[PDB]
Design brief:
With about 10 residues, this protein is low in regular secondary structure. It is about 0% helix and about 0% strand. The protein contains no helices and no strands.
Length: about 10
Amino acid sequence: TXPGVTXPGV
């Protein structure tokens, strides 16, 4: 995720 907690996605 995120970053943080990429995206999703990417």
